[PDB]
Every structure is written in C-alpha cells, then in structure tokens.
RNA sequence: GCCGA
DNA sequence: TCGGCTG
C-alpha cells in the first residue's frame, strides 16, 4: 500500500468533520474525528470514537462505537466519491515510480531546551516534618526515609505546571500532589510527574514534559554498576538499586538506555492481557525479562508485595537477580505464566 | 464500547 | 469532566 497518501487523504477528507485532531505523535499518524456514520454521541463529543490509524502500511479507520473497521479507500468509496477518483487516479499514478518520502528526511527536534532548574510551590519530602500528611502518606507508602531526598510535595501543581508549561489548565485551582522531577543521564530534571495522593487526586494524573524530547525514565542518573532493572512505576522503582522506571502509555525499547543490561521487571498481572502482549513483545526482542511465576507473593506491585504482604527489599532482590529469563526458555517461562 | 485520572 | 485504546 501507500501509506502517505493514506494520510494526505484522510486528513483532507476529515479536516471537515465535528471535533476533528491530528493527533500526531513521532512515530504515529492519528486522526480522531466524530464518526459520520453513527454520529458517536451528543454528550461524548470530545469523546469521539472516530479514529484513523496511518502509522501501519495500510491506513485504517476503526470506530469503536459503531464498531466500523475500515480502510480509508472504503470510507472514500461510500462517503467522498469524487476523492474516491481521485485516490484510484493517484494510486495507479504513484505506483509506476519510486517513493519519494525519503528524499525530504529530516528531524526538527532539539536537546534540553526547557531545564527545569527550580521547582515553585513545592517542598522537598526530606526537609518536611515527620508529621505532615504527605510524610504519613508515604509512611503507609514504606518507602526508605533515605531517598525522601527523591520527592517533592506540593498544594498548587497547576501553578507549578504553568510556571514551567504556561497555558496547560485554564485555571490554576491548587492541588496537592507528589512531584516526582524524573532526570536525565547526566542528573539535570527534564520533567515531573505529579503522582495522585489520598485514594486519588481529583483530575489530570499526568507526567508534565519540559519538552516533547525529554526523558520518561525516572532514575537513570542514579544508576550504577551492575544489571540495571526497568519497573512502571517511579515509587516501585525506588525500592530497586540500579532501578529505573518508564513514565508513560508508550513502551519505545531504543529510548532505553542500557541495552546489554537492562531487566524488564513489570507487574505480576497473569490474567491482564496486555501485561501478556507487553512480556510478550519483549521476549520477541530477544530481551531479558523478569518473570513473576515463582514469585511467594501474589500482590501486584514491589511496593504492593512490601505494604500488604510484609514483604522486605533484600528477598526482592534476590528474587529479581535469580528469575532472569532470556530467549526460549523465558518464551516457556512466559507460557507457563500467562494462565 | 474498555482503561486511566 | 477529559484522552487513548484494533481491527
Ligand atoms: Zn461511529
């Protein structure tokens, strides 16, 4: 197939619909759009299930509301005819010669643009008072008082935001929440992540990048000799030496440094499928993976295994450092995990 | 539609 | 109340 001028199409052919977005990440080409053909809803507009995928060889249209998979030939045959021409014209047009996407390859990236030198409204855990509530909260975290050196506290988060990323909330409404400023190799912060307190905080538990090209790997400065253990989450990393934790949906293996020596250590989910499909796609990589079939504990977290079945950091270890697992025999170690 | 806030 | 999600 074509793939680009999938996308030239379907971003002409639904620039026009209600509550159209390109969404555009560095590697996927999106389009979310109000579906024409159920119409989605009236109080889900911004929730609208039209969706184009053009990132694949092939670009496709998948609602999920009225459940309409299709390519965008198809969606060009029943609703644009005359661009449905225009698209058989063009296809058989481009076909006899050579793609010419290559020519134009460049990056318009940059490195660190936006350093987060200082964090406002916000106060180091470990120059808190043990009384506070967030000092108790993370008491009831167990987390050790020795990387409280590691998180900040803070009550006006969208402030902070907008004192780095300007016009993200339209209202700067004060929200306690735990910063945790994730860093890069050589120590400096290129984001935050403002960690959900009390059962859950009230709206947008999200990582705030300095720059789209900052790092989503919590700990990577505090990184020393030795096989490097990769977790989902930055307080389940922090119980690990040489433990460094993914902040964000997207799962890129080349952003990951430490390609001789990283550990995939993830939840302990068997019956949740894509935890499957996450190993699953590791293991296809030929990567070493941490395997939870032999685990004494059936919590679902390291900080999970500590805070509700008593678990201690030195069996973790030991644990990790013994079910490494890499090529056929973690592909059965996987097998036998999965159900 | 499912999940996260 | 929002975004992101395969076929
Ligand atoms: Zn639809």
């Known amino acids: 197939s074509i793939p680009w001028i999938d996308n030239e199409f379907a971003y002409r052919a639904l620039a026009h619909l209600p509550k159209?977005?390109?969404?555009?990440?560095?590697?996927?080409?999106?389009?979310?759009?109000?579906?024409?053909?159920?119409?989605?809803?009236?109080?889900?507009?911004?929730?609208?299930?039209?969706?184009?995928?053009?990132?694949?060889?092939?670009?496709?249209?998948?609602?999920?509301?009225?459940?309409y998979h299709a390519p965008i030939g198809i969606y060009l045959k029943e609703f644009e005819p005359d661009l449905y021409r225009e698209y058989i014209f063009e296809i058989r047009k481009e076909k006899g010669k050579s793609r010419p996407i290559e020519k134009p390859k460049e990056l318009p990236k940059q490195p660190e643009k936006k350093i987060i030198k200082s964090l406002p409204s916000c106060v180091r855990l470990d120059k808190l008072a043990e009384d506070h509530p967030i000092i108790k909260y993370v008491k009831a975290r167990c987390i050790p008082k020795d990387k409280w050196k590691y998180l900040w506290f803070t009550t006006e988060w969208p402030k902070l935001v907008n004192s780095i990323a300007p016009g993200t909330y339209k209202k700067e409404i004060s929200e306690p929440r735990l910063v945790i400023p994730i860093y890069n190799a050589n120590g400096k912060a290129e984001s935050f992540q403002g960690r959900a307190l009390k059962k859950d905080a009230p709206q947008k538990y999200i990582t705030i990048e300095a720059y789209p090209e900052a790092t989503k790997i919590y700990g990577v400065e505090r990184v020393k000799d030795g096989d490097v253990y990769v977790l989902e989450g930055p307080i389940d990393s922090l119980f690990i030496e040489n433990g460094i934790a993914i902040t964000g949906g997207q799962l890129d293996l080349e952003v990951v440094p430490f390609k001789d020596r990283r550990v995939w250590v993830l939840d302990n989910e068997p019956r949740h499928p894509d935890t499957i499909k996450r190993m699953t796609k590791l293991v296809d990589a030929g990567e070493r993976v941490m395997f939870w079939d032999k685990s004494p504990w059936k919590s679902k977290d390291v900080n999970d295994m500590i805070r509700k079945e008593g678990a201690t950091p030195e069996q973790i270890m030991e644990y990790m450092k013994n079910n490494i697992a890499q090529g056929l025999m973690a592909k059965m170690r996987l097998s036998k995990y999965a159900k």
């Open 20 to 67: 159209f977005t390109q969404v555009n990440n560095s590697s996927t080409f999106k389009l979310r759009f109000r579906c024409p053909v159920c119409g989605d809803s009236k109080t889900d507009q911004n929730k609208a299930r039209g969706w184009y995928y053009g990132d694949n060889n092939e670009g496709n249209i998948h609602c999920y509301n009225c459940n």
